[PDB]
Amino acid sequence: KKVNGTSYKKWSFDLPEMSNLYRLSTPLRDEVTDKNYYYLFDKKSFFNGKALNNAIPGGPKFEPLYPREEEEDYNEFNSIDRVIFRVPIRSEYKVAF
Amino acid sequence: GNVDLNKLTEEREKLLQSQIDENLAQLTKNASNPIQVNKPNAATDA
Amino acid sequence: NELHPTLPTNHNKTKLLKSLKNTKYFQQTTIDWVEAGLQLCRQGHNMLNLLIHRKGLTYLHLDYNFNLKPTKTLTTKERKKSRLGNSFHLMRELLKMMKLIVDTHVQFRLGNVDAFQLADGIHYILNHIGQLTGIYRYKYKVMHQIRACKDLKHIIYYKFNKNLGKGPGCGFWQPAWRVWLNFLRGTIPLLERYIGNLITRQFEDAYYDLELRNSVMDDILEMMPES
Amino acid sequence: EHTIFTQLKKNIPKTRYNRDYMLSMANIPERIINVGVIGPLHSGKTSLMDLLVIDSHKRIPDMSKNVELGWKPLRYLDNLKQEIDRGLSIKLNGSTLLCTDLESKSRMINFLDAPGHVNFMDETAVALAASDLVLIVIDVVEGVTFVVEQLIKQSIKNNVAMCFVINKLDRLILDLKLPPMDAYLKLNHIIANINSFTKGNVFSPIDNNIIFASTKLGFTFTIKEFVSYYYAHSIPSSKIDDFTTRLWGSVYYHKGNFRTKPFENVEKYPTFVEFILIPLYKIFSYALSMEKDKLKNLLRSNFRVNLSQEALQYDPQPFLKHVLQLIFRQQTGLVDAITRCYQPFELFDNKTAHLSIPGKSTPEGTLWAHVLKTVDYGGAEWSLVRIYSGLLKRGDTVRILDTSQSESRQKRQLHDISKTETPSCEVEEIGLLGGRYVYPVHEAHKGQIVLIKGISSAYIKSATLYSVKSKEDMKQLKFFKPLDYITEAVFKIVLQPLLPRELPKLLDALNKISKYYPGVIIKVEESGEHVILGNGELYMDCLLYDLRASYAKIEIKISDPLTVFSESCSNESFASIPVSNSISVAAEPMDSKMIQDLSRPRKLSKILRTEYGWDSLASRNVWSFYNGNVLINDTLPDEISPELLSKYKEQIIQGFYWAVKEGPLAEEPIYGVQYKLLSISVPSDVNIDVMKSQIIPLMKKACYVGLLTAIPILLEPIYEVDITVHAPLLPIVEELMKKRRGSRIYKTIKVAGTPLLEVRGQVPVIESAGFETDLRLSTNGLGMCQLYFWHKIWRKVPGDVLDKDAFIPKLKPAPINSLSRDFVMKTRRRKGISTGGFMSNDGPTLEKYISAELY
RNA sequence: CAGCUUUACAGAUCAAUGGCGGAGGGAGGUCAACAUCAAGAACUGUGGGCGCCUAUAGAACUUAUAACGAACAUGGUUCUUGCCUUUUACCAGAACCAUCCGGGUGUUGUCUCCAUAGAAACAGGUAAAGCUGUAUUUUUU
Numbered sequence A: 001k002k003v004n005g006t007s008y009k010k011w012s013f014d015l016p017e018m019s020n021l022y023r024l025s026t027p028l029r030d031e032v033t034d035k036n037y038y039y040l041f042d043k044k045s046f047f048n049g050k051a052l053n054n055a056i057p058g059g060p061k062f063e064p065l066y067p068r069e070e071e072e073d074y075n076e077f078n079s080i081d082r083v084i085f086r087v088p089i090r091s092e093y094k095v096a097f
Numbered sequence B: 001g002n003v004d005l006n007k008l009t010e011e012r013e014k015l016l017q018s019q020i021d022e023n024l025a026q027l028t029k030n031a032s033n034p035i036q037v038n039k040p041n042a043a044t045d046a
Numbered sequence C: 001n002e003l004h005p006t007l008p009t010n011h012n013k014t015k016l017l018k019s020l021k022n023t024k025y026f027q028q029t030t031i032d033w034v035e036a037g038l039q040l041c042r043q044g045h046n047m048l049n050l051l052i053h054r055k056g057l058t059y060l061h062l063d064y065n066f067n068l069k070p071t072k073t074l075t076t077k078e079r080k081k082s083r084l085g086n087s088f089h090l091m092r093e094l095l096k097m098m099k100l101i102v103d104t105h106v107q108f109r110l111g112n113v114d115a116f117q118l119a120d121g122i123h124y125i126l127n128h129i130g131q132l133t134g135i136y137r138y139k140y141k142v143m144h145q146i147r148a149c150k151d152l153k154h155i156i157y158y159k160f161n162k163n164l165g166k167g168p169g170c171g172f173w174q175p176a177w178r179v180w181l182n183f184l185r186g187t188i189p190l191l192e193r194y195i196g197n198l199i200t201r202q203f204e205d206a207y208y209d210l211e212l213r214n215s216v217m218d219d220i221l222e223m224m225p226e227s
Numbered sequence D: 001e002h003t004i005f006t007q008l009k010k011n012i013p014k015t016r017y018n019r020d021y022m023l024s025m026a027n028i029p030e031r032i033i034n035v036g037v038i039g040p041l042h043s044g045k046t047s048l049m050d051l052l053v054i055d056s057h058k059r060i061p062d063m064s065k066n067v068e069l070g071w072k073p074l075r076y077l078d079n080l081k082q083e084i085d086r087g088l089s090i091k092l093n094g095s096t097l098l099c100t101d102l103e104s105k106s107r108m109i110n111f112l113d114a115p116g117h118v119n120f121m122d123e124t125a126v127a128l129a130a131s132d133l134v135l136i137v138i139d140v141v142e143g144v145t146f147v148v149e150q151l152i153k154q155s156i157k158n159n160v161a162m163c164f165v166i167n168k169l170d171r172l173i174l175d176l177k178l179p180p181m182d183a184y185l186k187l188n189h190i191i192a193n194i195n196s197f198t199k200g201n202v203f204s205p206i207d208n209n210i211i212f213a214s215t216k217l218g219f220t221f222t223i224k225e226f227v228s229y230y231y232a233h234s235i236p237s238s239k240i241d242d243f244t245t246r247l248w249g250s251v252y253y254h255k256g257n258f259r260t261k262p263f264e265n266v267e268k269y270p271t272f273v274e275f276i277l278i279p280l281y282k283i284f285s286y287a288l289s290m291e292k293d294k295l296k297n298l299l300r301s302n303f304r305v306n307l308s309q310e311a312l313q314y315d316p317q318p319f320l321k322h323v324l325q326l327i328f329r330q331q332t333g334l335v336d337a338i339t340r341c342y343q344p345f346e347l348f349d350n351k352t353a354h355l356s357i358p359g360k361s362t363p364e365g366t367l368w369a370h371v372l373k374t375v376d377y378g379g380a381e382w383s384l385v386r387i388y389s390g391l392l393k394r395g396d397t398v399r400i401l402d403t404s405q406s407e408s409r410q411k412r413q414l415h416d417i418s419k420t421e422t423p424s425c426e427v428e429e430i431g432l433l434g435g436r437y438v439y440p441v442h443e444a445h446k447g448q449i450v451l452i453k454g455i456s457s458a459y460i461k462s463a464t465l466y467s468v469k470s471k472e473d474m475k476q477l478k479f480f481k482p483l484d485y486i487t488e489a490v491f492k493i494v495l496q497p498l499l500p501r502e503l504p505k506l507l508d509a510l511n512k513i514s515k516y517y518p519g520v521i522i523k524v525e526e527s528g529e530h531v532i533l534g535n536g537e538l539y540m541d542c543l544l545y546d547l548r549a550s551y552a553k554i555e556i557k558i559s560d561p562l563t564v565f566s567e568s569c570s571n572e573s574f575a576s577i578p579v580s581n582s583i584s585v586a587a588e589p590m591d592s593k594m595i596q597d598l599s600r601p602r603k604l605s606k607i608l609r610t611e612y613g614w615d616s617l618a619s620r621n622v623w624s625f626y627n628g629n630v631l632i633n634d635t636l637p638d639e640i641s642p643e644l645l646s647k648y649k650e651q652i653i654q655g656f657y658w659a660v661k662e663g664p665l666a667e668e669p670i671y672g673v674q675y676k677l678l679s680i681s682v683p684s685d686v687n688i689d690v691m692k693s694q695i696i697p698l699m700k701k702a703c704y705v706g707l708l709t710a711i712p713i714l715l716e717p718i719y720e721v722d723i724t725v726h727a728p729l730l731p732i733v734e735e736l737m738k739k740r741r742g743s744r745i746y747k748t749i750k751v752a753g754t755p756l757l758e759v760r761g762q763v764p765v766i767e768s769a770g771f772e773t774d775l776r777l778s779t780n781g782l783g784m785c786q787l788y789f790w791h792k793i794w795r796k797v798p799g800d801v802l803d804k805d806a807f808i809p810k811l812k813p814a815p816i817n818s819l820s821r822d823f824v825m826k827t828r829r830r831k832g833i834s835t836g837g838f839m840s841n842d843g844p845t846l847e848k849y850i851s852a853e854l855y
Numbered sequence E: 001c002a003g004c005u006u007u008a009c010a011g012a013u014c015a016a017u018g019g020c021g022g023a024g025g026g027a028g029g030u031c032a033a034c035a036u037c038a039a040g041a042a043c044u045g046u047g048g049g050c051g052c053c054u055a056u057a058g059a060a061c062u063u064a065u066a067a068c069g070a071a072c073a074u075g076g077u078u079c080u081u082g083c084c085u086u087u088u089a090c091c092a093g094a095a096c097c098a099u100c101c102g103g104g105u106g107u108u109g110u111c112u113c114c115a116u117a118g119a120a121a122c123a124g125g126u127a128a129a130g131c132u133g134u135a136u137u138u139u140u141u
């Protein structure tokens, strides 16, 4: 009665056995499940990075996904002498916001 | 694909006679082509 | 993969159909897997030979571990005769791979072996196709798969060997196996198609303007089917 | 008229209580509690609201299978794509619920889900303004964080009744795995902290103020509620209150029907622990761990509740949640607690006075409402408005006044003490909140908060709407102040649109942003550089998304993030020199305490001054400050008391105001200065208007001169910084702090019964720039930073401005003394004051700066 | 310790009214065949049973989003890198279609185990199950 039957399609347990199984697993699949661990390592984050052509030192890199076209050409906006470079502004940021 | 001419074809079918078809004027090379061929060739007869 | 998902819909599977309607498929012989594998390998070997026969009968001959090579009479004409297709080569490679895994199982079943060695052997097979046989010579999208497998192996080995243990002894073939399965799945249909084509060997930009010219002419002709 | 209404009704969830009844109730005040649920980031206030919504409704539409089961939380009041995807509640989308009490006196509740994340205090502020009770929520684990304390403080300003909800018992039961005694102790500690944070009142489970909860597992209760459910069988009705009272505190219960002696014998486990916490623990353990049959039996016996056939086959967490729900019934306890908290209407008057000056109301003759927030509930712009008095019917034509036009109006009224209504508004439709629908209604009523659809055109951010019928009525009327959007903006961003063919579109969107997000000082600058002061990064990002996706749909360039700096001095002034095209003035740096006071009747003023900064009588007499910046303007020469030229001040200080607004150094506002007039050489030939005009420039010039004299500085703001790290990652945090320029660790507060070192701090907003992300990455998903500005704490940008040598590198960050100047120069450039890629600062007038200050 | 409801019952008259239906199974199968696929589901239409449930079929709008499948391989064309110059065969990134490899849900039928009446209650008895209960100022001393 812990399964549907010999088809082996649905399964349904009690606790102690499950616990035991989990314990057994522990060496193999110790994925650290504090959600926050994956800040800037979620699929969404990765996608964002890809569409921004941006890395995370651990994370993957790609072909940039849009035409890499610069030519902003230094207006009163986005000049060197107007904006102030106190912060280094890493890629880590660019995907995180 | 080939839709814009179907109507035209239909019209043609409707209109023409056999006699008319028989007397379609065998066409003259309005951009006098063979003369030009002759002339360039003669100029550049190797 | 995550970025580009894939959708299916209504379908009727092949194996089930075969089981049901088609003779001469009688069914459900509960084989020890190894035996079945061996049988498959044998059949694979047979099939290639058959295919060859159907073509111009070649000088080359297969090993039972499928490593194709020429017997003798190495000439230009011969080469021309016996280039055949990359699909065929790929199939052969696949068969070889199967044999290798099946052969390890066979070895395990008999003496001169171990269970640990079996797992390790399997791992070696999977995580080195690049060593053991070239499918990468015939369909290079195998190469991607191979690379992936290698990466997986690498991941495992650090994961495995935190302790003093370091060397060839390691099982855990699962993710590699999965990868291989996926690859097979990707490749099967094309292979099947190729096979079908082979068997059915008796039965079956700027051109636009030209096409227009032709089509219009045809239409005109149709319009006037006179004397 | 009717058909449309019917259609609207149809496109909505059908509710367990009758909507008609609710509407009827809303006619009658004292039956409408406006509550703002408000807390720290991820308290679970939204979740709680969702629970309430669930309880209310029969079936909810988007309520999928998983949510029902209880894996994913359902935030019914998330609504918007932004929010659904983000994980943060990001605006004020509440709802209106008829709820019964313990003893079912039905009462309609205008609930408002404030966001927790600090950078949206704007929304929190709005909620506070709206709400007369404020359901503070707290995470058990993170404890009473500084944020909570701040909220409490700022709620006691408002002012409001503070019901507390200690949410996340589940986390101390399950995650921290506290012994029940330990848990109890922790709770007590939390309560104590809360009390401390509070000035006047005292908070405890007794007297229905605390409400213990866990929204993940989906159960809230008060002690009283618990007693009602599961301690009425065992005891008579006379000794129930007494029992309840006994329940909380250092009190024990050794065998005796029904005594109960304080202290004590043999075994521990107090009354609270005994009759509540322990039970909860048991429930948890049996729900997860026990064989099911036994649990079922227990639940049949001890709680009188039946597990269905399906419910037995649930997975543990969901199952646990279900069990909890079964136990503690649809959350009336919370409602009861809220009711108990709200006095009511002793506070209400005071609150209204605070919002809109003291005085007296006028019910029948005129209706008045506080247009609080503009929002986008159902795509289109609505206005959430609290009708304070009177009743606002559909299609009524209504007066409006943006709380910019409020102080001025008041002044005018005072002066007064032909008819002139300045703007108007046709009220096209009105309805209730909310979650995922507006329930449309004809009548707005004195007490209830409602979304109105006509209100927008005239107003932006906050407003007062009304409908008078007389001069007397008008006279009586008062106008709400603008909301003290607690945090106050700092964080700068400059927009351009990528293809300026669509500047107009951007502008349009920008207006919407300003309206919809009300903590958004959007200055349009002279040089086409449209500017946005957000609270901070995340908020700004959200706003950008709203703009760039929804309210505009354009590729929109975005500057690296700046901050507003402001102008102040270190030393006092040394030479008041006038200017002519004739006044001279000079300024002193104010005392820190005084400044702080300012940030948070002449005789009275003098007294206050004396109390604060040890100022003399003369000093007290002289002063006349402005702007809430803050600067102080002193009339302190010798001749002015005999003179009637220095008399008539109302005109004179216009110039000063202007100066304060836009300084010398950066045209970036002045702060933290006590100005002193030293001479006003007015000629014989008056021409009064002309003279006034002259003064208006001249005063500004004088101020500038004074500032220059006083060794002026740009002040950076500082972000006060919460960091809730796991203890052994504090060194990492410290390292991180060290790595950047400005930063400081004031106090490492160990949170009670957790591994979380709540390590408060200071960081200059400029050098923040995604600091949160940096913190999180470094600390491997531990220690959610929070940055904020409630304090309005500014500071020196290190070093001396007005030094041409300064620094080495252009592209890189500059050193600290050097930086003193660099920012200033860049600010100037941005403004359009300097001329060139290489330039300097100096202040006229005159005489070559007094011959370079006499060499 | 009282009440009514239900089950087992004993023999009643036996109406009587209600219920129960004038009785059609419940499992499961690496058994098939047949549809129909994110769950929605509002809302409208029409069924069948009572402002509303249960089936359907028509879009709205949803959020899909993480998981029809906590799975991931492969084609084909068009655009774009790049091998380059080419047949494959490809590097690596788009777009839109398709291809396998798996899946549920009901409609049915068939094969292996578990079942098992052909109708009961009225009037209240027996036995159990399910809920409801100590006068001195505001209810009944």
Ligand SMILES: Nc1nc2c(ncn2[C@@H]2O[C@H](COP(=O)(O)OP(=O)(O)OP(=O)(O)O)[C@@H](O)[C@H]2O)c(=O)[nH]1
Pocket: D040, D041, D042, D043, D044, D045, D046, D047, D048, D073, D075, D087, D088, D089, D090, D114, D115, D116, D117, D167, D168, D169, D170, D171, D213, D214, D215, D216, D217
């Ligand atoms: N362990 C635990 N988690 C909870 C509890 N309540 C809520 N959560 C989780 O923590 C998160 C916070 O819930 P929300 O309601 O989104 O928080 P919030 O009050 O909306 O916070 P804002 O977004 O700032 O308004 C969710 O992902 C919940 O699943 C609780 O009592 N215990």
